[model samples]
Target: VCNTCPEKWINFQRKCYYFGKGTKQWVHARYACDDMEGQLVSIHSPEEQDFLTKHASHTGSWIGLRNLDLKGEFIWVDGSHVDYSNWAPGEPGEDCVMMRGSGRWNDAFCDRKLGAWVCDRLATCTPP
Candidate 1:
């Protein structure tokens, strides 16, 4: 993680996370995570998710998710299921777009190019 570029991981609330920079397709981002021997970090609690919302900015980044497996049902590539989300109103709209940067997750077409990203390694992560 430290070897990556400018390091997007912000030490917020005592947790370390790197928000990927630039736009990428969600699946592509998931592959990136896989190469790193990890999957996109899934938000386990409201608190961590909220912290991400606070620091996450302007271009929406990709977390682990896909409707490709099942329409309307988004799940993390890490195999964890998400029931709570901060998606923008009327999101995950058409297509397969899964995340928005407005501090919320939404469903949308997959072709949109938002910033693709992932959270830090959960195994090594700790809460503040």
Candidate 2:
């Protein structure tokens, strides 16, 4: 029970999570999340990663980790430094990324469509 999170949003560790119901390209997913007042979502810990992956479709789901601005240099949706990752096996650069059925990360074309996406924002009972 979190006063800061809206209806339909899951509250976890003082943050709010939103799972998109439709498929969207990586770019569109990011924009959709921003329109909802959240980021595309970044995974910084195993627990957090597990939580999001658990909710993603068994096929695919968008997660905010990309190297669009700089090749081979991944960055989170909020531009936060990446301190943790669960990369599967040998894989990389097609640019935007998604968490696959195996709960491992993979880079894919930015325009590729995924079954769903995750959005996140800090829980705020009070805001400026």
Instruction: Judging by lDDT against the true structure, name the best candidate.
Output: 2
The per-prediction tally of clashing pairs is 14, 0
**Model 2 Cα lDDT, one tens digit per residue, 2-80:** 3488778887777899988687999899899999999888889999877877777788789989985766788997988
> Against the unseen true structure, what C-alpha lDDT does each candidate score?
0.61, 0.84
TM match of model 1 to true structure: 0.69
lDDT by residue for model 1 (58-124), tens: 6667676666465566666656676766667666555343445556776655666666576556434
List the pairs of residues colliding in candidate 2: none
TM-score of each: 0.69, 0.89
- The stretch of ten residues in a row with the least summed lDDT in candidate 1 is 1-10
Off by over 4 Å in 2: 1-3, 125-128
